[PDB]
Amino acid sequence: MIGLVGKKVGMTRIFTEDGVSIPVTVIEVEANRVTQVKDLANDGYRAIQVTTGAKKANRVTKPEAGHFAKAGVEAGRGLWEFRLAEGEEFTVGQSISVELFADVKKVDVTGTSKGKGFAGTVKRWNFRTQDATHGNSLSHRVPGSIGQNQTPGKVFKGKKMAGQMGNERVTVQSLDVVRVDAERNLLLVKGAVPGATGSDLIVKPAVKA
Amino acid sequence: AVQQNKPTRSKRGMRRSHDALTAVTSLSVDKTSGEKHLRHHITADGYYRGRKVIA
């Protein structure tokens, strides 16, 4: 199937009658407007491009304005593209509500995780810290050995070192759908999704059925 | 912790290539005093956006 673009509103919980507190994630999914439908005859692959939200004429540029004018819809935050399966068809300018998730049970959410900046090896790769005492000198959280003697004579690629952590595209798979709503443009997903409050999320049906 | 060969004037020139200054272009003029000043900064005489704000 296809997915939708939402904004992460935050997290809360839902109490059920049998006394279960289900931690959920509120995802505001407004009606996505389709701007361009690509097919094999002109693009080599079939897919749709959608937009969500609202911008202002002062904030939109001339190429984006022309693209949205040719599409016939109002300008949204950005443009996201969903791969089409075989059989499903969509028209330019079509508004896609959150009724697509009315029958799904598990969804995958994708979004840029929080940015941890320059993180150390202990924070990033869960290295075990060395001794804080017993003579240890200036090596309390250092990575330690990063190779072998002159036989390799180098450091292998993909060696876990300190560096940039977070702030990257992360997908969480097979999240149970708790409650869908169209009049409020909501999507309550059980569990945690990547990103901060107010980040753009991409919610698609779970591939790992 | 020290070099085994000396780097050249070429490597020195490249490392110094990335360390260069940049000339400020945002030089506005005051509508009333007519003197050059940085954007969002008061003039030498105490004017800003055509209003004497500093004695």
Binding site: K114 | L38, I42, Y48, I54
Partner: protein, 119 residues
């Protein structure tokens, strides 16, 4: 990670930072305009605008709070007499930052911070 944290520490511990802001608030209320480094100005704003907010109302308790926060009888007197009823028609935002230039000693971004009414 400075995630949604506010306030600049300005290479000072909490005591020195609070004392410097107290002295700078006193000096700003005394002279109605001063020149300081741009981050010092942006933090002095957050320090000294609540003082004028306390000065807008008038009570013994508020005068005592302002004296606790400024430690200057002359400053609290001026703050409750002149600047108090003066900003009665403003909804906050009593100061004005005017970036002057760069200090000759260490090349720091200087700025004149003044009261909006000083005319």
């Amino acid at each position: 990670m400075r995630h949604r944290k506010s306030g600049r520490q300005l290479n000072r511990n909490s005591s020195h930072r609070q004392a410097m802001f107290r002295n700078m608030a006193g000096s700003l209320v005394r002279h109605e305009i001063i020149k300081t480094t741009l981050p010092k100005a942006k933090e002095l704003r957050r320090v000294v605008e609540p003082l004028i907010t306390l000065a807008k109302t008038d009570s013994v308790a508020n005068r005592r709070l302002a004296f606790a926060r400024t430690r200057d009888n002359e400053i609290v007197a001026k703050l409750f007499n002149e600047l108090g009823p003066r900003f009665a028609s403003r909804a906050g935002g009593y100061t004005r930052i005017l970036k002057c230039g760069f200090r000759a000693g260490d090349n720091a971004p200087m700025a004149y911070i003044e009261l909006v009414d000083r005319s």
